[PDB]
Ligand binder design. Structure first.
Ligand SMILES: N=C(N)NCCCCN
Ligand SMILES: N=C(N)NCCCCN
Lengths: 112, 45, 159, 50, 112
């Protein structure tokens, strides 16, 4: 969950060793040649007094399919709440294992 | 002068991937590649 | 008493809920929503609560709060299957000691679930050799339709 | 004398202690609890960092 | 990740019910006679402005192997960052399962 009135900004310069509340998803695979992906989405409400919903997804698929999936999960979360959706911010990454790899996607919450 | 309690007010989206000798080293390499390799994550759910 | 929110939580609330979902994460989310803590971020903690923390009904939590929460959950996509989650809080007689939280989840009835989590808390005190004051708990069961989740938690906050 | 690291984000830990322990239990959670106890951190709420 | 300059100290007397940030590894087994181990390593940098790195490991092996592995994992973490390693502190424990046991290792962060 993203606190109401929070702002999506580029990762700030975090203090070394800070304890950062973070929503993330990851997948690890040792299958040579396999493509694995991780994705994160943030559903932002039109009603700014409501919070934002963070959804994560990981799987043995392309980053395109992972981002599509995680964005739909966020959409569903807002429908379940019956909240008007402003938009969804999402990010995804894919990795093709060589020997043993990990794909990781996160939403780091901090303070400014 | 007087610390005021507050909820997080910023959210950043990052992502990364990496190979590794072990699952944890690969995970570590991914966070590093994502740009958050030198902070401790407290996973929220 | 200033900076109260920077000290340890002083209340605990037992909640539980269940729900179906199009995906496991959406079902879990639906379950949290159904339990009353769907709009806060949960920080899963080990099963210990501060000494003298007061058990109270879930307070009105600010959306986005980072709530230290001990919880148990189970997700099933087997139609007709019954899943349950239970949570228990064991309060010690010695007020200087911490309280114990135990969580449980499984393919059983709400009744069996609560009975089990209650026994677990008792064992927690026996292993410590502490005198028990009492144990409070709640359970929830859900019969999967397509994809469902049973959730039980002990959320720590401030009074 | 108390602190909630989730709220006091500006106050970072400055010590680290290595502990370990093990134990039997009548349930997985109880075994886990016994191990933390054997390790010396069974009477605190652990916020797992990763 | 451990904050720069954090000091390795014997586990202090922790207040009852305190919230303690902790990196840990554990393994639970219900197979009689089976041996299980858990280990933690803390890699300290020569450059004191840099973070310490904590690695955890768990598996069905001796404490000697588990500690050897977690120590190797910390070294690898430093090599991936290109940081000069000062030393590595490690701890391991092994448990021979009777009916249901758990092996646990941790790096508890605290204040001083
Ligand atoms: N860089 C981090 N904070 N975490 C990733 C590595 C985790 C080692 N236990
Ligand atoms: N409502 C919550 N805080 N969590 C429900 C699960 C959503 C995980 N991104």
């Amino acid at each position: 969950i993203m606190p109401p009135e929070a702002e999506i900004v580029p990762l700030p310069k975090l203090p070394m060793g800070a304890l950062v509340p973070t929503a993330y998803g990851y997948i690890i695979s040792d299958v040579p040649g396999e493509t694995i992906s991780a994705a994160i989405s943030v559903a932002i409400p039109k009603d700014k007094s409501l919070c934002g919903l963070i959804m994560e997804y990981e799987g043995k698929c392309s980053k395109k399919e992972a981002e599509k999936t995680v964005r739909e999960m966020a959409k569903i979360g807002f429908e379940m709440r019956g909240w008007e959706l402003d938009r969804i911010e999402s990010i995804a990454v894919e990795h093709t294992v060589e020997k043993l790899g990990c794909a990781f996607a996160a939403a780091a919450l901090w303070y400014k | 002068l007087h610390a005021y309690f507050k909820l997080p007010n910023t959210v950043s989206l990052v992502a990364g991937s990496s190979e590794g000798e072990t699952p944890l080293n690969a995970f570590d390499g991914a966070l590093l590649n994502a740009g958050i390799g030198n902070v401790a994550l407290i996973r929220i759910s | 008493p200033l900076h109260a929110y920077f000290k340890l939580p002083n209340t605990v609330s037992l909640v539980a809920g269940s729900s179906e979902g199009e995906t496991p994460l959406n079902a879990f989310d639906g379950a949290l929503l159904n339990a009353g803590i769907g709009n806060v971020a949960l920080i899963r903690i080990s099963s210990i609560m501060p000494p003298e923390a007061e058990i109270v009904p879930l307070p009105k939590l600010p959306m986005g709060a980072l709530v230290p929460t001990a919880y148990g959950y189970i997700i099933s996509d087997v139609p007709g299957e019954t899943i349950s989650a239970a949570i228990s809080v064991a309060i010690p007689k010695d007020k200087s000691l911490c309280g114990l939280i135990m969580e449980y989840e499984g393919k059983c009835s709400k009744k069996e679930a609560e009975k089990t989590v209650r026994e677990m808390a008792k064992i927690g005190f026996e292993m410590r050799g502490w005198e028990l004051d009492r144990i409070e708990s709640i359970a929830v069961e859900h019969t999967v339709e397509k994809l469902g989740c049973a959730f039980a938690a002990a959320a720590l906050w401030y009074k």
